[PDB]
Symmetry: C3
Subunit: 390 residues, 3 copies
């Protein structure tokens, strides 16, 4: 029959308002405030956390403050292991109320909520990002959110910790928690290597032209939303590749210029004309490597016929010292994918190459280059096949 | 007086939490999951639907599963007619509770909710997209959401069906249901016809240059959000025009290049100089044709002085074989409008035309062309006059 | 201990569902409908307002309609003063219920809600944009929203009024109230002054080339979201500068062309070659002037090392009459900042300048220029340092 949830005679239940809050959170779970480690109250038998608020699949969880320590987690028996400190909801448990709403003594022992240590495979099997209490096909009764990597040493020592920032709704994303900017950078200058195909380093280090003969590796300002993307964990690809953490339709914006651009000089033999040199800037996705996503999670497989390379800018050098470009595209990206940008040109400097024979500031380079990568759409349901291949 | 809705002494009512959920849905109604046709349980007297959840102006509606058929709709008396299967809320009806919250026997016969067949004019007069239960000026008591076009044949046959995808929040738009991408495509190549003004086909078929003498009509990947736009229903305009289904401020992104671009060759007579040829890429809106929107709904009239054409790219060919371009603009668009892109240049190939005299790959063409159209703002209230004219 | 807010045994309270609605409003407070001044029912002793709905930090407030006047505010004692008409929540007050939910006589005198006159410093000390009832560090019990500037004259006269549009969620922003477009314009043409550095007027008046010898100040269509930005209040900077009203990561899109672009003519002395002229289009932020934000509010100080200028387009003129450009960047902006766009080139017209020696349509100018400024991210928490410097 046709059931009303929110109507005059309806009883509005707890799964109901939690389903509403989840919708209001754009189906994102995470710590809204606090819940960071309290090292001062952390011993070799206990792990302390500060007060705060989290939302886990629409269920509001609070660590209350008083007097500190705001909360204590038992670390007895944990040694020489890397574990995940998790906030878990277990709907098989019973919340025990006591006292009364008549006197001012009503309290609940929320046994459905736990702060616990899990290993990586156990967390993954019940991770909120892959499984749901509200799921249609495979509904779960137990769901977790990892807060910290906790590395326990020998018996009698305090452990080492690393915050799981993808699970904290810290800042930059309030209002649109599941979307917004994935990555962005300030303008940078990057020397073009004398090769046909090369990646443009988008992870905060560029090969900056500094003199007429030299370039040097130089940091530039970059930001990444850890919920959406991360720098590649393999050092070979760390300067260039992002790992996508969340499926979706993403917008890629690029702008900059090609400085000291090569071209065939106008001479009597070519009827005093500039001989343009072809170049292209491409964005690329690659999913050949599995388990690149956070916790080594299984990648989300793309639909059959998915794109791998897309031309953002494709043209010839125009005979000017510096030529600007700009491009905006929407592209599908999948959890576990690598994403990168490439500069492509010919290798014959006297015939087809956009680059010259110089080095540093005397050599062809990208100048004032910047990008923004933003999540603008999801790939749930039918969108996976209809929108996911490009 | 000043009334509190959510305060300590307030009674939080059913219209209240439904007004809250509607706000949380960005004022969009639609099926959240399931509610698709069940052909196996569909006869000549009954129409079956699978279980699911919908939100209609903040009211949560559920079709419950058990044992199937999840729900049955009486089709007796319906023959040789095209009807709309609708989910309707009727606040004039009474929801009948039975049993008690003390025993575990509390139930409700939700007479305020109906699954019914309506003709197009009846649905339009009570369509959620144009009328509201929460409306300020004209509050309604009955509101509907169309789910399927149902075409009944002769008495004794099962009917034909077509899903109304604009009313299903399927995928791509979760989190931002009333906004996001309206249309997008992968890069395509399109031959420039030897005319002053022509539309660029944005609907999935381009005239692709394939040889030195020929081009051929070729499909390219395209996606449209049916809630925001649709391909023009008239075959004359189907390759080029979109029909806007929702008022708003939209962002249009375009990028690509003009390949085999024409220019006056540098000769002794012109002092060995390239004679550039002017071209422009424009986006256009046209509202002369009424009833192009879904169901033949009345178009939303634009404010006095509304734009019709906007230059995205306006420049000269630079003497290169291929020249890239990019542009981003925000534009106002109205339900019922046609939206299209045009390429504009002179017609004299030896004087003012950006195109040459060649055909296929030897002729001037758009290369690596793509676009994204996205809804970024609404046109409610004062914005209609202040933001709606451009 | 671990407390559940939304669980089976939880009591869902009034601060709770107000915290939920605030989250659903993207932490924006404002009038959702009505609440505009009623001049017909306004005397020298009373100020009338029409019915409507507002949300103040998740608390729903309603002015009920009946018979009008929908509400009356006592103006006795107010004279020769500019005041702010404010809607205030005071949690120190007691809401007085009467009657019963058994009979149909339950009513509340909401003493926690006031419509009052405050001076600018008092409103600022309890303004919802800077302080919160739900605040972590400094929780408040009293919070206000300014609705109108009210200027009272001599005793016996009706006052003058000006709506505070930043506090009305009127239109353009429903669905994403705290984000969306900040400013946008239609295409305009603007004469380039014969100077090294100049601002591009983004506030609705351009110096339009009209003849071969003259340009004239001409209005063009522009829109600003008053919640996000405003035209500079100082006349010296009014044609060019925006004042940012809300911290965040903003997206700036620009497009247009440089028409009648200057270049060194190809002659036998330069081997029949175009001598390109460097130019750049930059966006800029400046926070040297305090109190530019609405009500003269204190500016939000940017993190150490914040950017001030960013190149959007940097290249040489290519020897064409008209050359197009486009650029998209994300930038951090702070409440109280000035934001503007600049055109930068050399001043020697025979050597390094992108501009020529002509005037009006015979002189170098921006053609088909437009922009969109959009709020795309916040700068709360860690994002302030990680994302706020660029
Ligand atoms: C299995 C493996 O290491 N594959 C890598 C892939 O991860 C990476 O994205 C790509 C970059 O060009 O190179 C290889 O394909
Ligand atoms: C009444 C009618 O058919 N008008 C059409 C309009 O629908 C369409 O948008 C336009 C395309 O250029 O051509 C005409 O104006
Ligand atoms: C204190 C003062 O008036 N400073 C102004 C600043 O407000 C403005 O943004 C800038 C524009 O270039 O000029 C000055 O710096
Ligand atoms: C041919 C090519 O693209 N080579 C890239 C190189 O530019 C990049 O620096 C390196 C690390 O990402 O990976 C290679 O695959
Ligand atoms: C002069 C002009 O713009 N002609 C267009 C044509 O390019 C387009 O293919 C056709 C169908 O959309 O409609 C015409 O109006
Ligand atoms: C050198 C420079 O940038 N001058 C600008 C000028 O172009 C602008 O018209 C005026 C008002 O905004 O402010 C000046 O600072
Ligand atoms: Zn649910
Ligand atoms: Zn996953
Ligand atoms: Zn956006
Ligand atoms: Zn309502
Ligand atoms: Zn309509
Ligand atoms: Zn709160
Ligand atoms: Zn402030």
């Amino acid at each position: 029959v046709l059931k009303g949830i929110n109507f005059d005679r309806s009883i509005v239940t707890p799964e109901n308002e939690a389903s509403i809050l989840d919708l209001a959170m754009q189906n994102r779970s995470g710590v809204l405030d606090g819940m960071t480690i309290d090292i001062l109250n952390t011993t070799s038998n206990q792990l302390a956390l500060f007060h705060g608020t989290a939302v886990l699949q629409g269920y509001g969880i609070e660590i209350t403050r008083a007097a500190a320590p705001d909360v204590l987690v038992d670390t007895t028996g944990q040694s020489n292991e890397t574990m995940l400190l998790c906030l878990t909801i277990d709907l098989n448990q019973v919340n025990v109320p006591s006292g009364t709403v008549g006197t001012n003594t009503y309290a609940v022992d929320y046994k459905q909520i736990r702060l616990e240590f899990l290993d990586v495979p156990t967390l993954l099997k019940q991770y909120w990002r892959d499984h749901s209490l509200h799921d249609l096909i495979d509904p779960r009764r137990v769901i977790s959110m990892p807060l910290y990597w906790i590395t326990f040493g020998q018996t009698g020592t305090t452990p080492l910790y690393e915050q799981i920032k993808s699970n904290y709704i810290d800042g930059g994303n309030s209002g649109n928690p599941a979307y917004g900017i994935a990555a962005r950078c300030e303008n940078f200058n990057h020397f073009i290597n004398k090769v046909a195909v090369q990646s443009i380093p988008i992870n905060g280090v560029a090969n900056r032209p500094v003199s007429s003969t030299a370039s040097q590796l130089t940091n530039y300002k970059v930001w990444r939303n850890p919920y959406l993307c991360s720098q590649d964990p393999r050092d070979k690809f760390a300067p260039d590749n992002l790992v996508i953490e969340e499926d979706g339709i993403y917008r890629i914006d690029i702008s900059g210029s090609i400085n000291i651009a090569n071209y065939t000089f106008p001479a009597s033999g070519n009827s005093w004309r500039v001989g343009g040199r072809y170049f292209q800037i491409v964005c690329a996705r690659n999913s050949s490597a599995n388990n690149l996503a956070e916790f080594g999670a299984e990648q989300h497989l793309p639909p059959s016929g998915v794109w791998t390379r897309r031309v953002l800018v494709g043209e010839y050098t125009a005979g000017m010292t510096e030529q600007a470009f700009s491009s905006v595209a929407t592209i599908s990206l999948f959890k576990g994918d690598n994403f990168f940008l490439q500069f492509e040109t010919g290798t014959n400097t006297s015939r087809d190459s956009a680059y010259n024979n110089g080095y540093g500031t005397s050599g062809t380079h990208l100048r004032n280059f910047s990008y923004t990568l933003e999540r603008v759409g999801d790939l749930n349901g039918t969108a996976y096949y209809d929108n996911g291949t490009f």
